[PDB]
Design a protein around this ligand. Structure first.
Ligand SMILES: CCCCCCCCCCCCCCCCCC(=O)OC[C@H](COP(=O)([O-])OCC(O)COP(=O)([O-])OC[C@@H](COC(=O)CCCCCCCCCCCCCCCCC)OC(=O)CCCCCCCCCCCCCCCCC)OC(=O)CCCCCCCCCCCCCCCCC
Ligand SMILES: CCCCCCCCCCCCCCCCCC(=O)OC[C@H](COP(=O)([O-])OCC[N+](C)(C)C)OC(=O)CCCCCCCCCCCCCCCCC
Ligand SMILES: CCCCCCCCCCCCCCCCCC(=O)OC[C@H](COP(=O)([O-])OCC[N+](C)(C)C)OC(=O)CCCCCCCCCCCCCCCCC
Ligand SMILES: CCCCCCCCCCCCCCCCCC(=O)OC[C@H](COP(=O)(O)OCCN)OC(=O)CCCCCCCCCCCCCCCCC
Ligand SMILES: CCCCCCCCCCCCCCCCCC(=O)OC[C@H](COP(=O)(O)OCCN)OC(=O)CCCCCCCCCCCCCCCCC
Ligand SMILES: CCCCCCCCCCCCCCCCCC(=O)OC[C@H](COP(=O)(O)OCCN)OC(=O)CCCCCCCCCCCCCCCCC
Ligand SMILES: CCCCCCCCCCCCCCCCCC(=O)OC[C@H](COP(=O)(O)OCCN)OC(=O)CCCCCCCCCCCCCCCCC
Ligand SMILES: CCCCCCCCCCCCCCCCCC(=O)OC[C@H](COP(=O)(O)OCCN)OC(=O)CCCCCCCCCCCCCCCCC
Lengths: 42, 96, 313, 167, 80, 105, 98, 70, 114, 347, 110
């Protein structure tokens, strides 16, 4: 029975699964000398 | 080496515990006279204090039995000053 | 009178921490075929004083911290736990002769990771927070084997009392029944204190957003923990002869053994490369902990099969 | 004044609970719970529970609050906080003022107004801590308790590795 | 049983030593002639007071004085 | 339901931590061992409905041993009357209640 | 009864009302839950030491072990929630209203 | 050469020697020329309080021998 | 309820054993051998009556035989027993094992003379 | 999940419930509840979607709050009684706290606010475990402490559970929220008769577990989680529509079905004790439960909702699901009212 | 009491040296500098593996907490039961470690 309160409720997906809706980037700067721009996965 | 020395340590422990067991009846008699001294003192001073209060009976046991109940810490050191209170109630715990 | 005893404990702790830096730089000097500091004092004796007066007049580095309160409370807790580990230590008489001194030292050393964690929170950087979490994971990893090695030794003591651990070791050192626990204990105390080959904080640190004053405070808390773990290891495994009419024999003897053990820390950081982070995690969880559980079962069942259960008192 | 040391530590305990239960942030909430754990541990230590107090410092503040801070460090990063703080603080000081001017209060149950030193035992336990021997009897007497607690911790390991896998 | 054990002692010596020490700790208290003496000492350490019995008149196996010859003794513990 | 497996099998899984009067390590008694033993031996087997109104005095003595409400109330009364007499000056404490007399043993 | 039991019961009810009134986070709710456990520990310890009921001295250790395993389970749930939504706010956990 | 590390080691060893020697001398100074009475257990504390009561001058470390009985 | 029935202060007066704990622990095994029967009457009466008010006279007999024991030590072996309890009295934990030769001298003098 | 691990975890859930049942010590009751929750958390997170982690988080918070209230009730019992026997409680405040804690573990109203969310977020097998097996431990503890349960508190909880479980299931089209509000209403019925004659509490428990296991087994055999997907079952297998017809008519309390048995014996045992207004209000409120059961039967069994074309492919494949005890449970949940004096075996 | 005075003195000296180390170079003005790290502006990535080793520490710490009364439990009269349950607790700690091992829980921080 749709009221004003429960009016924006859409039904859940059929498999009870909602969509999920990255990785770290390290810029090892010059602080011999070398600037490494890493991309790490843990 | 630890076998020989821990067996010798258990023999020394038994000797010290039996020294305690040999001393225990004298310490028990002195402790019983100590607590009966303190309870008789609290009874006599409750008699000389609680004359103003109506309906008060001095020495009135809060228990319904006639069995000896081991006296509470406040039942012994109630009417005594704060130094004796602290020495008896946190003396062992605060000792180093 | 007791305040005199507290001060004569905790001021020579600070002086020994100060001159440990001189001992370390000299001894790592000669092990690296060079000389240590010998310009400042007569053979360098004025070097920790110069270094202390330098580090206490350097500019505050001033990050606009996420937390000012934890930026204050991390060195306070670091020095406080660094100095309260020393008060149950029997040498030959302890300051606070408590019934549970071993478990007290284990508890107050378990609390020492909050300086690392709060000093990672107080800095605004994400990378300092990551490094602080790596250091906390390292220290809490090795606390497990501290606890189990400590329990496995105290099954030969009978109690948690530190002063009974001299009585235990009159006929022989307790490294002779427990040398695998001794060597794993030594590496575990080496890996608690972020000491080489386990010093990945030296390989960027976690507390680099402190001033040089508070850097000296964390530094002296770390060296107080180093001298403390070595004195506690000397009491625990290499305990000495105690004559009750001359306490100075046990004091000379544990001091000589504790200096040799702290110099063994200095001689181990000057010999080996650093472990990789997962390699010291491997060294703990897959190498020390199976042996520590196996020797814990062995040290439970051994005073029962030899009729040598130690006394409680 | 010194005869009320357990009461003073209990007041600091309640003040810390109003401090972090008003929830300023999980970081300062953990800080308030660590201060509260230390002072409640002091309450335990002043009754002769030395081993249970060191269980607090080694296990509670040593493992569990370390893991709570370790998770707060990597899974999260006013007027109502301070108002609810002074609400709880003034209600606690009203209770203490009542029970000290009156020596008897009843919020839900009746409470004494003297020091809780009065309720101790006047004896000696010989050559053993009774709390230590009661914990030492976890192995000889408490066999079923040790069985179900070890099974619960093994199942805890299995459950954590299941639900924290993503697959 | 002989080549597998040499193979695992070449690959993983830490775990082989761990399982061997754990197996010794499990089996060896059941094979020992000294496991009885631990029990005999722990039941002969006097933590409590040996509360005396009222002499009812028929007790030939309870002493009347501690130095009397009847009663349990600790000759075996002094000697071992 | 209460499936009494521990009595059907006759194993003691948790009957031993159940009461204070049970078998203790090193025969250490509780502070209210005798009170609880008397309440249990009074109210045993007669069921709870008769036990709550026929062993009322033993249970009141045991609860009063546990919480000591009447005892602390009595000591509050005595100390309050004594403080009134000290403040009015109508009473003075003897030297064995000020600590001047070299206690007994 | 004793005066310290007032403070420890009031501490449990304070951390209860902290748990029963969320502000923003789930971690603050877990900290309120473990404050509740801590107050239960201290209260059980004071009763068990005060009565000299010796065999219950092992009971607060069992309480601490079980509820710390419970707290580890809750931290794991919070970590999965934080992996899903980036934060640990409770207003992200409202997908089961319909 | 190598024996120059020994002045710093000597100063550090004296600074580690000071607290143990100091607490030994303070425990003998504040206890009548004896060791501090160790009371880990309540029976030891009961005997120590008994010494403090029988000593007369309210110090557990004042011993009263057979000169105190008749 | 009832009035608790306490003995008066004259009823509790007795000659005390006014010696230290190290003096007691040094002479302890000879005490437990020689003062057997009143000590065991007192502890049997103490565990059976479950009341110190019903045990005061046995406690006085204990406190009498203890003083008789120390009188008989004082008349014949004062100096070796003093040399022994001083050595027991030095230690913190009051060890017996630090004091074997003084114990041997006291045991020899007691076995010969008493 | 690994099948060895899943068997171990289910044995741990069962072991926790058995430890609550068979033990005489309050700490072991609390250990059984802790072990039960600790082991049931992965059964909800078997599918690894954010709805199940949200459901597990809400379940954790409610059951942990109830566990802490339960331990506080135990500790106040130790204050006022000095002992640990699982028997009557010796304080009305401890009785209130333990009744509140067990009401939170049962999900009885006004603590009912977790049961449809946690039931909806998780699959049908874990929902079956939640709505049947997790009722056995708190109802056993309530069976053991009934000499101390406050009358007005448990009756307020019972009628409030019945009314809110009646009005909650009317608006629902999801099947699992219908079963959760069914659970709230039936726990109200079970705890209403607890202080009068708790054998009828055990009877209502057993008949409810049989009916709920029948309905969840039918929902698993048809793989339906909504009303509108349940409504295609006549075009797939009409015998399942017949079984959900007779079982949903059973659960509302229609004779001659055995779901009339529990509420009729409850009404019978509350009229002995001079309560007449209360079982009449309870019976009249149960008509709302029967109303949304009739709505489910209208959508499934009595009419034929239009299906789609792809049902023609599912016509060709037989059901290879292990429908465990589904004919046995469906027979026991419908035709057991001629065996109504069987309830004496529960005495 | 000696212990509380000692804790107070240690905390006071620590707070004193912190106050000196924060307020001794506040005499030094030196400048009012503006002063505007590897990563630039990324949010803290969560690492699952650090949390797994934290919970592994917590559960093994609880098993250690169960193991801590063993030096006192050795003094019991029931030694067969005590030895069985001590070996059983250390064996459950080993089983927890082996399940942590073989299901790849101790990986990449081994
Ligand atoms: C005490 C309480 C006992 C409760 C019942 C216990 C068993 C059922 C629960 C466990 C379970 O799931 O077992 C599988 C279960 C089958 O469940 P299902 O798969 O849903 O049934 C569909 C067909 O079985 C599908 O057939 P199939 O092709 O897979 O294989 C044929 C199979 C082949 O059978 C065999 O292989 C049997 C030989 C091995 C038996 C076990 C030996 C150990 O035959 C059967 O199993 C026939 C069905 C058996 C009857 C099921 C219900 C039993 C009674 C339940 C309680 C009734 C209470 C009435 C009270 C009324 C008043 C209140 O049982 C069996 O396989 C064996 C049943 C043995 C009955 C013993 C009765 C005496 C007990 C005392
Ligand atoms: C898996 C279980 C492995 C250990 C089995 C029990 C070990 C043991 O000897 O326990 C004896 C111990 C102690 O036996 P006991 O002989 O020392 O007991 C005499 C009584 N007291 C305690 C006062 C000395 O426990 C029991 O007998 C009862 C508790 C455990 C019973 C078995 C539980 C099995 C659970 C299966 C699920
Ligand atoms: C206990 C362990 C060791 C503790 C530390 C060592 C003990 C000695 C500490 C004091 C050292 C001297 C004072 C701090 C340094 C002052 C140097 C400085 O920059 O001075 C210029 C500063 C400021 O000079 P300014 O006003 O010209 O500012 C220069 C900066 N500009 C131009 C950019 C604005 O002077 C001071 O801060 C004076 C401080 C007090 C001097 C000493 C007081 C007595 C101490 C005894
Ligand atoms: C348990 C043991 C603990 C020991 C801890 C301390 C270890 C180190 C001890 C001291 C070592 C040697 C000290 C002397 C170093 C050299 C000082 C010196 O000679 O300085 C010369 C300098 C300039 O002289 P000037 O007159 O200008 O030159 C023209 C000369 N024709 O003139 C000056 O610099 C002025 C004079 C300064 C004197 C400083 C002395 C050193 C102070 C160190 C601090 C610690 C002191 C001891 C504390 C513990 C004992 C209480
Ligand atoms: C972030 C906050 C601020 C951080 C910086 C400052 C705090 C951190 C550093 C200090 C930590 C304090 C820890 C205090 C308790 C330590 C445990 C303890 O006291 O154990 C020793 C002893 C047990 O041994 P035992 O021999 O049985 O006792 C003598 C009787 N025979 O027990 C005793 O001897 C008992 C003596 C009496 C009771 C002592 C209680 C001390 C006060 C309680 C803690 C106060 C601080 C609270 C916060 C701490 C940090 C979490
Ligand atoms: C009467 C029943 C309640 C008794 C305690 C009342 C204490 C005073 C607080 C009243 C409510 C204040 C409030 O705003 O509560 C909601 C608040 C969460 O909301 P928040 O996001 O902080 O603020 C936005 C406004 N909704 O919630 C919170 O901030 C929760 C804080 C709880 C801390 C409780 C501390 C003790 C309170 C006194 C003892 C009980
Ligand atoms: C009954 C006594 C108690 C027994 C159980 C408790 C043991 C106490 C010590 C605690 C150990 C905790 C951890 C145990 C985990 C065992 C599983 C394991 O580690 O398997 C992996 C390993 C190969 O390693 P991998 O898979 O490559 O992993 C990377 C590391 N290199 O695989 C291997 O290395 C193979 C391991 C299995 C074979 C070991 C054989 C040892 C034989 C020793 C001599 C006989 C001793 C008698 C008792 C034997 C008991 C098995
Ligand atoms: C006083 C009372 C004392 C106690 C007495 C006994 C009480 C009984 C309480 C019953 C509780 C039932 C709990 C749920 C079933 C337990 C077994 C289990 O875990 O089954 C789940 C399992 C998972 O299989 P899976 O492939 O994962 O399915 C989903 C994805 N396809 O497998 C499945 O999902 C298979 C599908 C069918 C499952 C049907 C299970 C029916 C169980 C109830 C039988 C009838 C009740 C017994 C008699 C009355 C007892 C009160």
């Amino acid at each position: 029975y749709p009221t004003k309160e429960t009016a924006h409720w859409k039904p859940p997906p059929w498999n009870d699964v909602d969509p999920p809706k990255s990785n770290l980037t390290l810029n090892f700067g010059p602080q011999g000398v070398l600037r490494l721009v890493m991309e790490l996965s843990g | 080496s630890m076998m020989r020395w821990n067996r010798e340590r258990r023999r020394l422990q038994i000797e010290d515990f039996e020294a305690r067991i040999a001393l225990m009846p004298l310490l028990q008699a002195e402790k019983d006279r100590r607590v009966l001294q303190m309870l008789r003192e609290n009874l006599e001073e409750e008699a000389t204090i609680m004359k103003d209060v109506p309906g008060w009976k001095v020495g009135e046991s809060v228990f319904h039995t006639t069995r000896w109940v081991t006296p509470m810490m406040g039942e012994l050191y109630g009417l005594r000053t704060g130094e004796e209170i602290l020495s008896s109630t946190y003396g062992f715990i605060w000792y180093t | 009178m007791f305040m005199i005893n507290v001060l004569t404990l905790i001021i020579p702790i600070l002086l020994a921490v100060a001159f440990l830096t001189l001992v370390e730089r000299k001894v790592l000097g000669y092990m690296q075929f060079r000389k240590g500091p010998n310009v400042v004092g007569p053979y360098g004796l004025l070097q920790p004083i110069a270094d202390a007066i330098k580090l206490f007049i350097k500019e505050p580095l001033r990050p606009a911290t996420s937390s000012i309160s934890m930026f204050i409370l991390a060195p306070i807790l670091a020095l406080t736990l660094a100095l309260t580990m020393w008060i149950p230590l029997p040498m030959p008489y302890p300051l606070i002769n408590m019934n549970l001194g071993v478990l007290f030292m284990l508890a107050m050393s378990s609390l020492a990771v909050y300086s690392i964690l709060w000093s990672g929170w107080a800095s605004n950087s994400k990378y300092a927070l990551i490094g602080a979490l790596r250091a906390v994971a390292q220290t809490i990893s090795y606390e497990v084997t501290l606890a189990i090695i400590l329990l496995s030794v105290l099954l030969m003591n009978g109690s948690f009392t530190l002063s009974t651990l001299i009585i235990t070791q009159e006929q022989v050192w307790l490294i002779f029944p427990a040398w695998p626990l001794a060597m794993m204990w030594f590496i575990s105390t080496l890996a608690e204190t972020n000491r080489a080959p386990f010093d990945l904080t030296e390989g960027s640190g976690f507390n680099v957003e402190y001033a040089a004053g508070p850097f000296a405070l964390f530094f002296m808390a770390e060296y107080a923990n180093i001298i403390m773990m070595n004195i506690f290891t000397t009491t625990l495994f290499l305990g000495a002869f105690h004559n009750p009419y001359m306490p100075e024999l046990y004091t000379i003897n544990f001091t000589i053994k504790s200096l040799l053990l702290s110099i063994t820390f200095l001689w181990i950081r000057a010999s080996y490369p650093r472990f990789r982070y997962d390699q010291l995690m491997h060294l703990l969880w897959k190498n020390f902990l199976p042996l520590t559980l196996a020797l814990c079962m062995w040290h439970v069942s051994l005073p029962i099969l030899l009729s040598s259960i130690p006394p409680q008192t | 004044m010194m005869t009320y040391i357990v009461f003073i530590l209990s007041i600091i305990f309640v003040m810390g609970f109003v401090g972090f239960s008003s929830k300023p942030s999980p970081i300062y909430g953990g800080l308030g719970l660590i201060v509260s754990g230390g002072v409640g541990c002091g309450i335990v230590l002043n009754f002769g529970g030395s081993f249970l107090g060191l269980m607090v410092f080694l296990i509670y503040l040593g493992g569990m609050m370390v893991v709570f801070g370790y998770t707060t460090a990597m899974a999260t990063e006013n007027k109502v906080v301070l108002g609810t703080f002074i609400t709880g603080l003034l209600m606690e000081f009203l209770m203490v003022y009542y029970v000290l001017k009156d020596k008897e209060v009843e919020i839900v149950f009746k409470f004494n107004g003297m020091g809780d030193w009065v309720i101790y035992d006047t004896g000696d336990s010989g050559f053993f801590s009774e709390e230590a021997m009661g914990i030492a009897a976890l192995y000889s007497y408490g066999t079923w308790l040790v069985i179900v607690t070890g099974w619960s911790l093994l199942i805890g390991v299995v459950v954590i590795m299941e639900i924290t896998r993503g697959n | 049983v002989a080549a597998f054990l040499k193979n695992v002692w070449a690959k993983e010596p830490v775990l082989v030593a761990s399982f061997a020490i754990a197996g010794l700790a499990v089996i060896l208290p059941t094979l020992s002639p000294y496991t009885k003496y631990s029990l005999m000492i722990n039941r002969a350490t006097p933590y409590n007071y040996p509360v005396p019995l009222r002499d009812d008149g028929n007790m030939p196996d309870v002493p009347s004085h501690p130095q009397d010859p009847q009663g349990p003794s600790l000759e075996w513990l002094k000697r071992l | 339901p209460f499936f009494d497996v521990q009595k059907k099998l006759g194993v003691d899984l948790d009957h031993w931590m159940t009461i204070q009067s049970a078998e203790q390590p090193h025969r250490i008694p509780a502070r209210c061992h005798a009170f609880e033993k008397e309440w249990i031996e009074c109210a045993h087997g007669i069921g709870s409905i008769r036990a709550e109104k026929e062993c009322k005095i033993e249970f009141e003595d045991f609860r009063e041993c546990l919480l000591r409400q009447k005892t602390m109330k009595r000591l509050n009364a005595i100390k309050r009357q004594r403080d009134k007499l000290i403040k009015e000056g109508k009473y003075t404490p003897p030297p064995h209640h000020s600590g001047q007399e070299d206690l007994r043993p | 009864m004793s005066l310290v039991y007032m403070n420890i019961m009031m501490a449990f009810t304070v951390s209860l009302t902290g748990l029963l009134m969320y502000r923003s986070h789930l971690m603050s709710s877990l900290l309120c839950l473990e404050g509740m456990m801590l107050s239960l520990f201290i209260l059980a310890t004071l009763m068990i030491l005060n009565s000299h009921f010796t065999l219950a001295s092992m009971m607060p250790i069992i309480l601490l072990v079980f509820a710390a395993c419970e707290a580890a389970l809750g931290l794991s749930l919070l970590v999965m929630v934080s992996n899903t939504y980036g934060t640990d706010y409770v207003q992200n956990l409202n997908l089961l209203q319909c | 050469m190598w024996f120059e590390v020994l002045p710093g080691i000597a100063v550090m060893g004296v600074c580690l020697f000071i607290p143990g020697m100091a607490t030994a001398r303070i425990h003998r100074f504040s206890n009548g020329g004896r060791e501090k009475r160790v009371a880990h257990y309540s029976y030891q504390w009961y005997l120590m309080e008994r010494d403090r009561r029988v000593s007369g001058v309210n110090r557990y470390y004042v011993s009263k021998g057979l000169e105190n009985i008749d | 309820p009832g009035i608790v029935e306490l003995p008066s202060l004259e009823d509790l007066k007795v000659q005390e054993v006014k010696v230290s704990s190290s003096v007691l622990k040094a002479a302890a095994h000879h005490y437990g051998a020689q003062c057997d029967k009143p000590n065991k009457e007192f502890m049997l009466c103490r565990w059976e009556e479950k009341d110190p008010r019903r045990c005061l006279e046995e406690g006085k007999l204990v406190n009498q035989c203890a003083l008789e024991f120390f009188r008989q030590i004082k008349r014949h072996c004062a100096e070796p027993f003093t040399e022994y309890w001083t050595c027991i009295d030095y230690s913190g934990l009051q060890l017996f094992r630090r004091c074997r030769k003084e114990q041997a001298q006291f045991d020899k003098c007691v076995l010969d003379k008493l | 999940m690994n099948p060895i691990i899943l068997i171990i975890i289910l044995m741990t859930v069962m072991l926790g419930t058995i430890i609550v049942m068979i033990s005489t010590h309050w700490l072991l009751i609390w250990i059984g509840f802790e072990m039960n929750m600790l082991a049931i958390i992965p059964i909800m997170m078997k599918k690894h979607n954010p709805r199940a982690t949200e459901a597990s988080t809400k379940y954790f918070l409610t059951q942990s709050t109830a566990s802490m209230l339960l331990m506080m009730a135990i500790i106040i019992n130790l204050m006022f009684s000095g002992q640990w026997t699982v028997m009557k409680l010796f304080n009305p405040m401890a009785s209130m706290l333990m009744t509140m804690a067990l009401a939170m573990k049962l999900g009885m109203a006004p603590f009912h606010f977790w049961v449809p969310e946690v039931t909806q977020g998780i699959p049908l097998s874990s929902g079956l475990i939640l709505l049947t097996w997790q009722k056995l431990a708190p109802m056993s503890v309530l069976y053991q402490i009934l000499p101390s349960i406050n009358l007005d508190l448990i009756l307020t909880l019972s009628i409030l559970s019945i009314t809110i479980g009646g009005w909650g299931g009317l608006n629902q089209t999801q099947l699992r929220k219908i079963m959760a509000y069914s659970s709230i209403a039936h726990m109200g019925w079970m705890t209403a008769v607890l202080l009068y004659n708790p054998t009828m509490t055990l009877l209502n428990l057993i008949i409810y577990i049989i009916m709920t296991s029948t309905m969840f087994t039918l929902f698993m055999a048809n793989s339906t989680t909504t009303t509108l997907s349940l409504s295609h079952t006549w075009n797939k297998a009409p015998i399942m529509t017949i079984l959900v017809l007779i079982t949903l008519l059973s659960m509302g309390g229609l004779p001659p079905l055995s779901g009339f048995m529990p509420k009729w014996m409850i009404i019978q045992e509350m009229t002995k004790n001079d309560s007449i207004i209360l079982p009449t209000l309870m019976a009249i409120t149960a008509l709302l439960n029967l109303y949304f059961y009739m709505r489910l039967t209208y959508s499934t069994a009595l009419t034929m909702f239009p299906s789609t074309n792809n049902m023609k492919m599912k016509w060709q494949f037989p059901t290879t699901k292990r429908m465990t005890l589904l004919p046995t449970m469906t027979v026991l949940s419908t035709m057991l009212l001629p065996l109504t004096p069987i309830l004496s075996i529960l005495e | 009491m000696n212990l509380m005075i000692t804790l107070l003195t240690n905390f006071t000296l620590a707070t004193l040296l912190v106050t000196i180390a924060f307020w001794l170079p506040q005499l030094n003005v030196y400048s009012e500098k503006t002063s505007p790290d590897p990563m630039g502006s990324a949010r803290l990535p969560f690492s699952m593996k650090f949390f797994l080793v934290a919970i592994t520490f917590l559960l093994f710490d609880l098993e250690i907490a169960l193991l801590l009364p063993l030096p006192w439990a050795s003094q019991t009269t029931n030694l067969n039961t005590m030895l069985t349950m001590a070996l059983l607790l250390i064996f459950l700690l080993a089983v927890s470690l082996a399940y942590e091992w073989t299901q790849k829980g101790l990986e990449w921080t081994e």
